[PDB]
Amino acid sequence: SGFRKMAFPSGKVEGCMVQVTCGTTTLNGLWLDDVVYCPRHVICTSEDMLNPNYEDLLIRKSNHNFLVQAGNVQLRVIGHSMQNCVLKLKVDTANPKTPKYKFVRIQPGQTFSVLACYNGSPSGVYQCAMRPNFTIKGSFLNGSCGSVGFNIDYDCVSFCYMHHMQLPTGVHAGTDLEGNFYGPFVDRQTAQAAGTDTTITVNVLAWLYAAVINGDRWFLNRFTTTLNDFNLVAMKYNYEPLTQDHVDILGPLSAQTGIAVLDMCASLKELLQNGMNGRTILGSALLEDEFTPFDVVRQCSGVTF
Amino acid sequence: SGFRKMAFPSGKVEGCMVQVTCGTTTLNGLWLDDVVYCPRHVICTSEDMLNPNYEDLLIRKSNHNFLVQAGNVQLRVIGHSMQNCVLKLKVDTANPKTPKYKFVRIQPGQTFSVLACYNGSPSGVYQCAMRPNFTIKGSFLNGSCGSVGFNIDYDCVSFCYMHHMQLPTGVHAGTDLEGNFYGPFVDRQTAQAAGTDTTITVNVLAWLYAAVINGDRWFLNRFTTTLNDFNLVAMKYNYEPLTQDHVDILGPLSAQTGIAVLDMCASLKELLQNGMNGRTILGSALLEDEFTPFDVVRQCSGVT
């Protein structure tokens, strides 16, 4: 029993973390086969970041300007190129610890594990959600850039995130592994409005189901509701509108618990309108939304890798 | 910036996780050098657990009755012994992925990472605290037993915990790596009173300091206090009494923020007496106590 925010085991990804350096800037790189992926802003001085022409800047750079370090071993860089906002440094050695991997662009609301690094050495690991406004609230200090997010789906590491930026707001933005930013952000040092954020409704519901499975049942009422009536309340409290796809996804949980999705929505409704009266649910005094239905099920059947 | 409950990278420990099996029961084992460590209740049927005589039960077992599996590879067991509540199965092969490691018995209030396994295969990783009553609130299902807790100090894995059981409470108990339970618990399926639990005061203070460093400053007051006056309030709300050793440990944080430890205690005091008025601190509506001062500093200087 018991329910914790669990990250995927980081082993396979640890073996791919290296240090990349260019002039002053040192940040992290992902080493898969004979290519190291890192944020392209590695090539910018502090001055360059205000308004960088990346093409012009990359053209001035030579292979030898790139110091790539895998622990004790220095890797020889034999080529460099740019794909969207990521740098692809070609090296003379294939990473022998390269796992089976895909590159995936996740949807907002979905979760992943982050392996936070500094100078290419793993620091720690935490699970988080891609906010509806395509930011993340994480832990990223100076030189944590290049740190990646991933999922393990059986034996395959699905890399979905690389950290680039901290917004003045103090939240974080980044790309998929093809170098495309999530959301409206750019790799420039300017004011950047993230969207109005919303609570991931489907995830909260999944978490409520987790609570019941773990014997925390105080919040269950004898009311029910409709999608429309519920969503009217959701809109008011800045919750993602709930769709049938969401109801369908919560089916297995609904089945195991014997509580209908609309019945649970009705309980959630009452919690939004009345608050929690300083009660906790699974040791939290607010409604957690960084557990997907799949996450809840994974942790409640003891799925391994 | 930003503040997350972070676990240590699990890689080095993944390489030591194996599956141990005896009769029906299968659980996890830790494989270091040529010895595999697992809970001794591996030898118990469901019936045996009500009231097991472990000596009598172990005597019936022979080397070959222990099936030890490291991924695909099966390890040959050449000896077995019991040390407190743990089994030490000696194998013919040294684990080639053995990291530099110590065994440590941690104090209550300290934190560690847990690598939850099932059938010797890593499931996931989370950070938690050893409660003052020597229990832990974790995630442990059927066959998660043998899962270990650890800290990494550079390249050295300090193993501090092995999970044994779930109390009727729904909390978890286990041993150090020499097989000694934390707290008053035994490896029997019976009612077991954990102590009155208390909030780890020093950890809360550390977390408050983290908040200020990350620009969450609403809770700072114009008041101060003494150790004794504060501790009188702490006792009332079931907080660990604060000592000078705790004040000393919070010094570096105190220094960076320019807020005296007693000044911060004064802010904590007011939060206990008045509650939080449904405000958050670092996105939490309660006072978090599973961050040690060292944890806070580690995350605030970017230590590997």
Curated annotation (Swiss-Prot), chain B:
Reactions the enzyme catalyzes: TSAVLQ-|-SGFRK-NH2 and SGVTFQ-|-GKFKK the two peptides corresponding to the two self-cleavage sites of the SARS 3C-like proteinase are the two most reactive peptide substrates. The enzyme exhibits a strong preference for substrates containing Gln at P1 position and Leu at P2 position
Effect noted on mutating residue 90 to R: In strain: Beta/B.1.351
Cytoplasmic side: 1-304
Residue ranges constituting the Peptidase C30 domain according to the UniProt record: 1-304
Location(s) in or outside the cell: Host cytoplasm; Host Golgi apparatus; Host nucleus
Activity regulation, short description: Inhibited by pyridone-containing alpha-ketoamides compounds 13a and 13b. In turn, alpha-ketoamide 13b (tert-butyl (1-((S)-1-(((S)-4-(benzylamino)-3,4-dioxo-1-((S)-2-oxopyrrolidin-3-yl)butan-2-yl)amino)-3-cyclopropyl-1-oxopropan-2-yl)-2-oxo-1,2-dihydropyridin-3-yl)carbamate) inhibits SARS-CoV-2 replication in human lung cells. Inhibited ex vivo by michael acceptor inhibitor N3. Inhibited ex vivo by compound 11a and 11b.
Effect the entry attributes to changing residue 142 to A: Does not affect ability to cleave and inactivate human TRMT1
Residues in cross-link Glycyl lysine isopeptide (Lys-Gly) (interchain with G-Cter in ubiquitin): 5, 90
Effect of mutating residue 189 to A: Does not affect ability to cleave and inactivate human TRMT1
Active site: residue positions: 41 (for 3cl-pro activity), 145 (nucleophile)
Domain of life where this protein originates: Viruses
Known function: Cleaves the C-terminus of replicase polyprotein at 11 sites. Recognizes substrates containing the core sequence [ILMVF]-Q-|-[SGACN]. Cleaves and inactivates human TRMT1, preventing tRNA guanine(26)-dimethylation of tRNAs. May cleave human NLRP1 in lung epithelial cells, thereby activating the NLRP1 inflammasome pathway. May cleave human GSDMD, triggering alternative GSDME-mediated epithelial cell death upon activation of the NLRP1 inflammasome, which may enhance the release interleukins 1B, 6, 16 and 18. Also able to bind an ADP-ribose-1''-phosphate (ADRP).
Subunit structure, interactors included: 3CL-PRO exists as monomer and homodimer. Only the homodimer shows catalytic activity. Interacts with host FBXO22; this interaction promotes the proteasomal degradation of nsp5.
Protein name (Swiss-Prot/TrEMBL): 3C-like proteinase nsp5
Taxonomic source organism: Severe acute respiratory syndrome coronavirus 2
Gene name tied to this protein: rep
Full-protein residues shown: 3264 to 3567 of 7096
